[PDB]
Structures are given as structure tokens and as C-alpha cells.
Design a protein around this ligand. Structure first.
Ligand code: ZN
Lengths: 88, 39, 223, 200
């Protein structure tokens, strides 16, 4: 009832299943001809998953006014973070 | 309340948000290992 | 009928306050509004019979649709307004029917129906003006709080970027100077990891230099 | 003439101002005018000018360096007096000279008069020249909607709820500076409900 991602570079991570719903294609490839619960997204480096999970948790960090602080800005990894946002 | 644990095991990572023993119990709830072992 | 047709339309507006018909009055410009466009095509100077006749066009729907606001006859009226579904006359400065409707006229019933039938929600004009960029700057905020509510709510449901940028760096939130429109904007948007990432990439002096997919280029150039 | 007039401190210049003919501006207003008068409720020229719906003589009065200060039986000079008058033009005229005002103890703040008047546009114009505390804004917008709930001239239930939503949300943008709504126990006469404080 918790989910765990598999890192293509070799360092997978264990995360809450609340984030599983808040996603683009995780729901897509957690159901279907496969998995009717760990999937290796082999399309990414491991360090990117740290910021992905940080944003994922940040989703519930500020849910339902006015004042919200800034998410930790990626200084130099954003060029690859962009190519990753559309993928998922 | 205010639970936000940046857990980082050996080549293992838990984003888990409780007594220190209860923390080991959560580690057992995942790694399924002895709480004393996961002191 | 350059001014006489507008005169009878004025006559209809008179009986409106004096206390199929609408379809027939529109049938007047059914093709005439299109021959207007054809003559504008024939010569550029022929827009002089037309400068207000774009307005007097949308002026009509500013009244005939105003009173319009049977179901089969209502579908007929939808067909009538469906004339410029794709026959979009590019007006001066790129202001469409929605774009002049938002600017203050300041109506909600006309603006909701023109969106309901279908139009370019994220249409960009000359100098990069957007539909949401105009509504935020209004000089009578406290006077009517029941109209800005409707316009702002209706615009976002159709789909428009709340983090858009003008030719110069001026977001719709930034251009807004009134003290209330900022709140009635900030209480409705959604956020994504994609926009927050692309915003910094565009902000940074580092350029993509065509190292990104082409379909991803207009989620960054727009931002 | 002030000598040939009624007993109670009247002036035929003011009586002519009732007529509002241009002959007044031609002869008497251009020449020397009545300096000052008073009555039971302490009328002065600057008041009766605002009360008169005719404003060319009133504007001309300002053009004659009209004194921006005056008094009555209560503490009212044209901000407690142009409020209920509804002549928005002379309100803008007096704002044009950057005049100020303090509260009237007998009545309320000049902003608060329009709150019970059911009138609305006046508040935004007044707020424009208003550089007072932001705390005033919070309480100056929950009373305009409240009056619409139970009044005579203009009754509209829909605006009442809408005009209070901005009011509460202007109290949660302050960064943990919520000026909460302290309330007494509910009075059985006024129903049995309680004044609301949560956003929902
Ligand atoms: Zn965006």
C-alpha cells in the first residue's frame, strides 16, 4: 500500500502512494497488460528523481490561500528537468 | 504532526514523513528488519 | 444601408427600451457582412466603409443577442452566429470580437456566448496582448464585483495561460495594478513542475539552441 | 442686500443662489460677497453651496479660493455633507483640492456614511484619496454588503454574500495577522446562529 520506484542508474526509491495518483503516466503504467508493484523508469538519471520526489511531496506541502513560498529552484539541472517534465 | 523525515539508508531511501523504536518499527514496516537491527 | 441598416437596428433598439425576427435582421448581413469583407479584400482603402461596420457588426450582437439572452430557433440563432466560426476578420491591431468585448461592452452575456460557440481563447494580438491582459486593468473595481467575477471565471475555464508573457517581460499578474484584481486572480490557478522549470530556463542566459524537441519549444518561447 | 433681508442672519446673495442665475456671478459674486452667516444648526456658505445641486457657483466659489474648512452643529464639512447629497461631481471637486477630514463624534467617519446610505460608488472614490490604515479597509467593506440584506430602496440578496467574500479573504493575505472576529454569545432575539469567522 506504499509504492517504490526503480532508478535506471541503480538507486531506486520508496515513496508514499498518495503521489502515485498525482502524476502523468504513473497511473498509466501501473495498470494494464502489466501489473494487474515496482517499475524501473530507465529514462532518467538518479539525481533528477530527488527533485521529482521533492516536488511530488511539495504538492501536498501546500494544498487548498494568498501566501505560498517558492519551490527550491534547480540552478543548473533545469535543462534536463524540462526534457523530463513532458515524459511523465 | 510536522512529520518530514529525510530518511537515507545504505543505498536505500525512505521518504517517510513516533518513538525511535516506532521509527525502527516503520523501518520493519518497510525493510521488514529487526527494530534493534534498524536501531 | 451603410448607415440606414444601422438606423433600423437603432429603431429595433428603440422599441427595446420603448417596450425568427433576429435571424432575419442578421440575414441582412448574412452575406452582406461577407461582401463587406470581399470589398475589403478588393481594396485596402475599402475598410473606411468598414471601420465602425466591424463595431456595428458586433454592436448588433451587442443588442440582438442581448435580447436573445424555442430551442430549435435558438439552434438556428447559433447557426447564425456560426458565420464567423472560421471566417475571422482580422480587425485593426488584432482585437477580435472577444478582445473588444472585454475592453470597456464590459458585458458578460455576450462574452459568455461568444466563448460558448467557439473562438481562439489564447489569441495573441499585435504587441502581444492577451485576453486576460486587458481585463485585469479596469477603472471601476468596487463599482461592479459581479461582472469581473463572471468574466474572470469564464475565461479560465475555456483555457488560457496565467503565466503568459508579453513582448517585454510583463505577466498578466504583473500588468495588473488594481488592488483587487490581483486577489481574484491569485485565488484561481493551477501549478506544474513543467512551468516552474521552463520559466528559469528562459530566465537564464543559457539558451536551448535547438537541443530540445520542437513541440517543447512553444512551451518555452511562450513563457 | 444683507441690510434689506429677513431677521435670522440671512443674505439675499444666498437667496439668489437658490435661483442660480448668471446675473449673480455677473454682479454680486464677482464683487464683494457676504462674509459669513450662521443659523440654528450653524449653516455656512460652504455648506449651502454643496447642498445646492448647482455647482458652477460652487466651483466658482473654489475658483475664488473658497475656504476648504467650515463647521456646523455637528462636525461636518462637505465630507459628512456631500456623502448623503450624492452629488459625485462636487465630491470629486473637493478631492481635487486634496482636503482632509477627521471623524464626527455625533455621526461616523465620512466613509461610513455611505455604508448605511446603501450608496456604493462613493466608497471607491473616497478610498482613492484615502491613505489611512489598511485595518479600516477590512471593516469598511463588511458593512456595505450588510446594509443591502435589510433595506428599502435597493434589495438584492446575491450581492450581500459576494461583498463579504472579498472581506474575509482580505484578512487572510496578511501573513498570520488575522484580525479575528470576537463575538458575544448568540442573542435569542436575533435568531440562534452565531457570527461566522472561518472562511468556509
Ligand atoms: Zn504556463
Amino acid at each position: 500500500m506504499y509504492v517504490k520506484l526503480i532508478s535506471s542508474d541503480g538507486h531506486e526509491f520508496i515513496v508514499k502512494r498518495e503521489h502515485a495518483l498525482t502524476s502523468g503516466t504513473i497511473k498509466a503504467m501501473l495498470s494494464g497488460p502489466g501489473q494487474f508493484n515496482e517499475v524501473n523508469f530507465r529514462e532518467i538519471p538518479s539525481h533528477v528523481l530527488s527533485k521529482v520526489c521533492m516536488y511530488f511531496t511539495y504538492k501536498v506541502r501546500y494544498t487548498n490561500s494568498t501566501e505560498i513560498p517558492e519551490f527550491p529552484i534547480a540552478p543548473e539541472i533545469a535543462l534536463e528537468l524540462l526534457m523530463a517534465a513532458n515524459f511523465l | 504532526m510536522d512529520v518530514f523525515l529525510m530518511i537515507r539508508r545504505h543505498k536505500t531511501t525512505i521518504f517517510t514523513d513516533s518513538t525511535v523504536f516506532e521509527l525502527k518499527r516503520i523501518v520493519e514496516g518497510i525493510l521488514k528488519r529487526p527494530p534493534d537491527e534498524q536501531r | 444601408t451603410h448607415k440606414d441598416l444601422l438606423r433600423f437596428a437603432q429603431v429595433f433598439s428603440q422599441m427595446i427600451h420603448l417596450n425568427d425576427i433576429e435571424c432575419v435582421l442578421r440575414c441582412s448581413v448574412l452575406e452582406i457582412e461577407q461582401s463587406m469583407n470581399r470589398v475589403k479584400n478588393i481594396s485596402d482603402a475599402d475598410v473606411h466603409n468598414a471601420m465602425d461596420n466591424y463595431e456595428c457588426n458586433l454592436y448588433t450582437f451587442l443588442y440582438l443577442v442581448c435580447i436573445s439572452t424555442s430551442e430549435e430557433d435558438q439552434c438556428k440563432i447559433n447557426k447564425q452566429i456560426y458565420n464567423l466560426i472560421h471566417l475571422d476578420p482580422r480587425t485593426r491591431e488584432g482585437f477580435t470580437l472577444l478582445h473588444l468585448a472585454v475592453n470597456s461592452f464590459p458585458n458578460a452575456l455576450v462574452t459568455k456566448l461568444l466563448l460558448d460557440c467557439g473562438a481562439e481563447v489564447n489569441a495573441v494580438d499585435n504587441e502581444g496582448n492577451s485576453a486576460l491582459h486587458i481585463i485585469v486593468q479596469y477603472n471601476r473595481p468596487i463599482s461592479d464585483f459581479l461582472t469581473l467575477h463572471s468574466i474572470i471565471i469564464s475565461l479560465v475555464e475555456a483555457g488560457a495561460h496565467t503565466d503568459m508573457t508579453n513582448k517585454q517581460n510583463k505577466t498578466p499578474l504583473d500588468k495588473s495594478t488594481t488592488g483587487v484584481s490581483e486577489i481574484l486572480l491569485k485565488t484561481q490557478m493551477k501549478m506544474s513542475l513543467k512551468c516552474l522549470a521552463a520559466r528559469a530556463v528562459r530566465a537564464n542566459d543559457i539558451n536551448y539552441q535547438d537541443q530540445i524537441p520542437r513541440t517543447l519549444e512553444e512551451f518555452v518561447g511562450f513563457h | 442686500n444683507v441690510n434689506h433681508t429677513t431677521v435670522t442672519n440671512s443674505t439675499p446673495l444666498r437667496a439668489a443662489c437658490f435661483d442660480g442665475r448668471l446675473d449673480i456671478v455677473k454682479y454680486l459674486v464677482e464683487n464683494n460677497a457676504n462674509i459669513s452667516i450662521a443659523n440654528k444648526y450653524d449653516n455656512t456658505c460652504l455648506m449651502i453651496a454643496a447642498y445646492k445641486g448647482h455647482t458652477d457657483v460652487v466651483r466658482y466659489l473654489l475658483e475664488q479660493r473658497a475656504d476648504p474648512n467650515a463647521k456646523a452643529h455637528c462636525g461636518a464639512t462637505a465630507l459628512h455633507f456631500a456623502a448623503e447629497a450624492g452629488h459625485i461631481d462636487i465630491v470629486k471637486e473637493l478631492i481635487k483640492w486634496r482636503a482632509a477630514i477627521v471623524v464626527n463624534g455625533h455621526g461616523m467617519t465620512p466613509l461610513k456614511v455611505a455604508a448605511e446610505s446603501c450608496k456604493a460608488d462613493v466608497v471607491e472614490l473616497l478610498l482613492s484619496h484615502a491613505d489611512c490604515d489598511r485595518r479600516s479597509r477590512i471593516e469598511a467593506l463588511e458593512l456595505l454588503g450588510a446594509s443591502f440584506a435589510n433595506d428599502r430602496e435597493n434589495y438584492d440578496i446575491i450581492k450581500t454574500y459576494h461583498y463579504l467574500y472579498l472581506a474575509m479573504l482580505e484578512r487572510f493575505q496578511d501573513g498570520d495577522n488575522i484580525l479575528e472576529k470576537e463575538v458575544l454569545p448568540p442573542i435569542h432575539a436575533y435568531g440562534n446562529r452565531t457570527e461566522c469567522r472561518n472562511p468556509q
